[PDB]
Design a protein around this ligand. Structure first.
Ligand SMILES: CNC(=N)NC(=O)NC
Ligand SMILES: CNC(=N)NC(=O)NC
Ligand SMILES: [Cl-]
Length: 310
């Protein structure tokens, strides 16, 4: 039975997370982004951006270095557990679109980047002494939305997280990836091939050559979900569920990539029938675009769920 994932955190004038915690149709919420990586950011701490959510306070380290990690995200801290008591999985997303100049420079820093995020946003640990930006919150895992600068270091972060997950056997944690169509994917093919993700949502918008709309109009490009299944079945990610990532309204992505619920039904019905043990559902970019695209009294994502359930 098939799932609906959605991104929240980067919506203009977005409602707070708890508004989406109450939308039953949501299965998984990815929260973006940890958009500053340790190698290029103050103090070698990662940094975060959550739109109108946190107050804008950043941590300053014991050394008095002013970081780019937001320290005043009180609404997110309150909201994540609500979502989790509604049975949703909340994943913390790494990367996104802005800024476009972040990457990982060494395997060492790839290990420290995952260890930092696990200390900061994972279970509360006795020996941890860094920030706890969401306090006692424990996210359900991490999403890799790497959109620039190549694929170095991410397989190592994923493998690192998994080693940590295993030290905590009583709870299942999750790893996911958001690549683009154009494959190999410059940022994430290596991670996908060489590490186990639970979920992979291919972004099927913003690239003309293989978009979801090219499914509807086959002269625009060639929709390539078939090739992606073949790649996945030889990867360390062979047990991943593979989702179709879509814009939740006309303006959530560049012109021409939004599909109407009718087009969505055609695509999804073919791919769910063709790949019943691999197809995972729909990912949506993003929560605020979906909230603002009300069709017959319900947001776009409610309609996506209805499509998936039938
Ligand atoms: C799709 N990624 C984003 N929109 N990212 C940001 O707005 N980061 C500040
Ligand atoms: C412009 N970059 C994006 N829209 N990124 C995402 O949608 N990542 C899920
Ligand atoms: Cl609100």
């Amino acid at each position: 039975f098939s799932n609906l994932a959605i991104y929240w955190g980067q919506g203009p004038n977005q409602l707070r997370l708890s508004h989406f915690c109450q939308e039953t149709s949501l299965d998984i919420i990815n929260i973006g982004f940890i958009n500053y990586f340790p190698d290029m950011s103050p103090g070698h701490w990662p940094g975060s951006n959550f739109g109108n959510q946190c107050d804008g306070s950043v941590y300053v380290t014991n050394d008095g270095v002013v970081t780019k990690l937001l320290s005043g995200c009180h609404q997110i801290m309150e909201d994540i557990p609500i979502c989790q008591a509604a049975g949703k999985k909340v994943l913390l997303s790494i990367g996104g679109a802005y800024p476009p100049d972040q990457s990982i420079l060494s395997e060492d820093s790839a290990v420290a980047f995952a260890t930092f995020l696990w200390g900061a946003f994972g279970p509360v640990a006795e020996g941890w002494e860094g920030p706890r930006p969401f306090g006692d919150v424990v996210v359900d895992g991490f999403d890799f939305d790497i959109e620039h600068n190549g694929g170095f270091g991410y397989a190592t972060m994923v493998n690192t997280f998994r080693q940590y997950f295993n030290q905590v056997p009583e709870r299942k944690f999750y790893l996911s990836a958001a690549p683009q169509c154009i494959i190999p994917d410059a940022q994430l093919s290596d991670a996908i091939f060489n590490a186990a993700f639970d979920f992979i949502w291919i972004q099927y918008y913003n690239t003309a050559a293989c978009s979801a709309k090219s499914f509807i109009d086959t002269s625009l490009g060639t929709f390539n979900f078939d090739a992606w299944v073949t790649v996945l079945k030889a990867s360390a990610s062979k047990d991943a569920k593979l989702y179709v990532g879509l814009p939740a309204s006309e303006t959530a992505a560049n012109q021409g990539y939004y599909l109407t619920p009718d087009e969505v039904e055609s695509l999804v019905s073919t791919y769910m029938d063709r790949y019943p043990d691999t197809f995972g559902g729909i990912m949506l970019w993003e929560a605020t675009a979906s909230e603002n695209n009300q069709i017959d009294g319900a947001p776009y994502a409610d309609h996506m769920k209805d499509i998936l359930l039938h």
